[PDB]
Amino acid sequence: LKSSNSLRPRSNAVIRPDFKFEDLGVGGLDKEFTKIFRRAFASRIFPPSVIEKLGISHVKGLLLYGPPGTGKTLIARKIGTMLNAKEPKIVNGPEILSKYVGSSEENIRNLFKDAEAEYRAKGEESSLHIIIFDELDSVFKQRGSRGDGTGVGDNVVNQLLAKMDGVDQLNNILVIGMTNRKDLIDSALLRPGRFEVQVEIHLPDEKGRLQIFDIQT
């Protein structure tokens, strides 16, 4: 299409204005959804002109942490498969480690090629990409700590740092991670520009329990 004047929020919207929070199927959590959807999926709806005059790059990180069995993976899934974007490249926890001297870090490098290719080829009209790290807290531990006597516990974290924010830019990705212990993740991963919005998910209050019961039955 082409609109001479009075262009749309998005010719192919990611959220698509026929959307409301009662369609997800996640009961209870309500403010969390508000904060998440505002901080992240607000800058990808307005016309490109105003956003470009504003010069703010979209947030490229999301972290969810909380006790076991609370709903984290549910949220990740619904976000993954209720949007208008390319299919997620799921990776489980220690799915990355490989046998030979140089295969784990190559595997990490493998995840970004389609995004860089399309961004290079097209630019701002590239469709969004999503990749989900499951159970982030397995491999990406604080550098220089005890454990990982083998020299892998550093190189892996290193490649990921260099690749999410480096000398070459990229702003058509959204990465999400889930965990039970955020106190062990490396400190350099939790700065603005890498995993910006962090959300705790807690046990439900009573009214939330009523909501969950109504959702299930």
Partner 1 sequence: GQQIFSQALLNANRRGEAKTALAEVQARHQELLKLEKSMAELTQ
Partner 2 sequence: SNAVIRPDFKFEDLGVGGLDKEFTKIFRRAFASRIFPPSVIEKLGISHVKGLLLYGPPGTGKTLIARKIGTMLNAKEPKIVNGPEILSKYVGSSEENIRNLFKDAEAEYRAKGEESSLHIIIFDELDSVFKQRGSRGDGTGVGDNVVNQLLAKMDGVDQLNNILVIGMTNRKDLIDSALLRPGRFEVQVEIHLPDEKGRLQIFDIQTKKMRENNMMSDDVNLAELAALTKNFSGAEIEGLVKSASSFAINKTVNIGKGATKLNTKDIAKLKVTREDFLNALNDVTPAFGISEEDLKTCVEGGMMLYSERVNSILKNGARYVRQVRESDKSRLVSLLIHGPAGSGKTALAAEIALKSGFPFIRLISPNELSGMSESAKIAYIDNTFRDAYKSPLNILVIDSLETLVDWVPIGPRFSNNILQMLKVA
Ligand X SMILES: Nc1ncnc2c1ncn2[C@@H]1O[C@H](COP(=O)(O)OP(=O)(O)OP(=O)(O)O)[C@@H](O)[C@H]1O
Binding site listing for ATP: 66-73
Q: Does 20 bind partner 2 (CB under 8 A)?
A: yes
* CA distance linking residue 212 with residue 146, whole number of Å: 42
Distance (Å, rounded) from C-alpha 90 to C-alpha 109?
A: 14
User: Rule CB under 6 A: is residue 70 a binding residue for ligand X?
Assistant: yes
Q: Does 144 bind partner 2 (CB under 8 A)?
A: yes
Tell me if 161 contacts partner 2 by CB under 8 A.
yes
Q: What span, in angstroms and rounded, lies between the C-alpha atoms of 72 and 64?
A: 7
DSSP of 113-135, one letter per residue? Answer: HHHHHHHHHTSTTPPPEEEEESS
DSSP label of 91: B
Q: Per rule CB under 8 A, is residue 100 in the interface with partner 1?
A: yes
CB of 99 to partner 1, least distance (A): 6
The answer for residues whose C-beta is within 8 angstroms of residue 161's C-beta and 6 or more apart is: 188, 189, 194
The piece of 62-70, 125-133, 155-163, 204-212 that touches partner 2 (CB under 8 A) is 155-163
What is the spatial distance between Cα 202 and Cα 29, in angstroms, rounded to a whole number? 9
Query: Which pair of tokens denotes residue 76?
Result: 């990740």
Query: 24-63: which residues touch partner 2 (CB under 8 A)?
Result: 33-34, 37-39, 41-43, 45-47, 50, 53-57, 59
Interface with partner 1 (CB under 8 A), residue from 1, 56, 101, 121: 101
Which residue in 214, 89, 97 sits closest to 155, CA to CA? 97
Nearer to partner 1, 123 or 149 (CB): 149
Out of ligand X, partner 2, partner 1, none, what residue 19 binds, judged by CB under 5 to 8 A for its kind, is partner 2
Q: For residue 73, what are the CA distances in angstroms to 70, 135, 151, 177?
A: 9, 10, 31, 9
User: Which one, 4 or 150, has the nearer CB to partner 1?
Assistant: 150
Inter-residue contact 176 to 75 (CB < 8 Å): no
Closest approach of Cβ 153 to partner 1, in Å? 11
Could you say which of partner 1, ligand X, partner 2, none residue 47 binds, taking C-beta under 5 to 8 angstroms by partner kind? partner 2
Applying CB under 8 A, the residues found at the interface with partner 2 are 6, 9, 15, 17-21, 33-34, 37-39, 41-43, 45-47, 50, 53-57, 59, 100-103, 105, 109, 143-144, 150-151, 154-155, 158-159, 161-163, 165-168, 187-188, 191-193, 196
